Design a protein around this ligand. Structure first.
Ligand SMILES: Cc1cn([C@H]2C[C@H](OP(=O)(O)O)[C@@H](COP(=O)(O)O)O2)c(=O)[nH]c1=O
Ligand SMILES: [Ca+2]
Length: 131
């Protein structure tokens, strides 16, 4: 019931935002269901680096909207972002560089996938969970 749509990287921004060209227009995308620390914070630089490498190295970036709101109050696109078929959102959580967060009803299709990744990152005491 969700579909992957094409996009191209404009520029990495931080752990959980990225600038993409979508349907030919520049847009800042905020990754659904996750929260990375701010660049100024602990693991913030590492979250930024992780996402940056992931999208910069991708041959193919895809955007997948959920069933609900597609833009937030700041005009940012809200999507699951994939790099060569791998979801950036889930990968950050799996590596402990993001927490599952901002789970609003109707835009939560991938919630359970994320929660499973967080549990495994927490079990492995990775990054954020190494405290
Ligand atoms: C991820 C996400 C964030 N937001 C809003 C809520 C938060 O509002 P406030 O700015 O009032 O805190 C903000 C969190 O984004 P950041 O984590 O990028 O700051 O973006 C949504 O509305 N929907 C979403 O799916
Ligand atoms: Ca954040």
């Amino acid at each position: 019931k969700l579909h992957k749509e094409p996009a191209t990287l404009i520029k990495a921004i931080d752990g959980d935002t990225v600038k993409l060209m979508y349907k030919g227009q520049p847009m800042t995308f905020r990754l659904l269901l996750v929260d990375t620390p701010e660049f100024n914070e602990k693991y913030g630089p590492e979250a930024s680096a992780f996402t940056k490498k992931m999208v910069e190295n991708a041959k193919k970036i895809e955007v997948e909207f959920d069933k609900g709101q597609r833009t937030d109050k700041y005009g940012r696109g809200l999507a699951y972002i994939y790099a060569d078929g791998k979801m950036v959102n889930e990968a950050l959580v799996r590596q402990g560089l993001a927490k599952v967060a901002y789970v609003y009803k109707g835009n939560n299709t991938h919630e359970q996938l994320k929660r499973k990744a967080e549990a495994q990152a927490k079990k492995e005491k990775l990054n954020i969970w190494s405290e």
